[PDB]
Symmetry: C7
C-alpha cells in the first residue's frame, strides 16, 4: 500500500511538471 | 491494480510533458 | 520498507522539480 | 502484463521528451 | 537491497535536478 | 523479463534526455 | 539482477541530467 501511495505521489508531481512546462510554452509564445 | 493504475497515470503525465516540450521547441524555432 | 521509502523520496524530488519549473515559467512571463 | 505495459508507455513518453529536448537545443543553436 | 540502493540513487539525482532547475529560475529572474 | 526490458528502455530514453540537455548547455555557452 | 541493473542505469542517466542542468544554470549566469 505504501508502494502504491508513493507511485501515486510520483504521478501527481509529474502532472504538476506537465502543467509548468505548458506555462513555459505559453510564456515563450508571448 | 493500484500499482498498475499509478504507473499508467505516470505514463499519462509523461506524455503531457512530451507535448509541452514539443510546444517549447516550436516556440523557440519561431 | 527501504523500497517504499526510496519511492517516496523520488516523489518529494519530483515535487521540488515541479516548483522549479513553475518558477521558470514565472520568470519567462516577467 | 498491465505493469509491463505501463512501464513500456513510460519509456515511449521519455523518448518523445528526448526528441523534444534535442529540438530545443537545435532552436537555441539557431 | 541492490533495488532499494538504485531507487535511493535515483532519488538523490532527482533532488540535484531540482536544485539545478531552481538555479535556472534564479538566473532568468 | 518484459518489466526488465521496459526499465532498460526507460534508461535508454533518460540517457537521450541527458544528451539533449548537454546540447542545450553547449548552445547557451555558444 | 536485470531489474537492479536497469534501475542503476536510470540512476546513472539521472545524474548525467543533473550535471547538464547545472551547466545550463552556469551558462545563463
Amino acid at each position: 500500500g505504501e508502494i502504491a501511495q508513493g507511485i501515486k505521489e510520483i504521478a501527481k508531481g509529474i502532472k504538476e511538471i506537465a502543467w509548468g512546462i505548458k506555462e513555459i510554452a505559453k510564456g515563450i509564445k508571448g
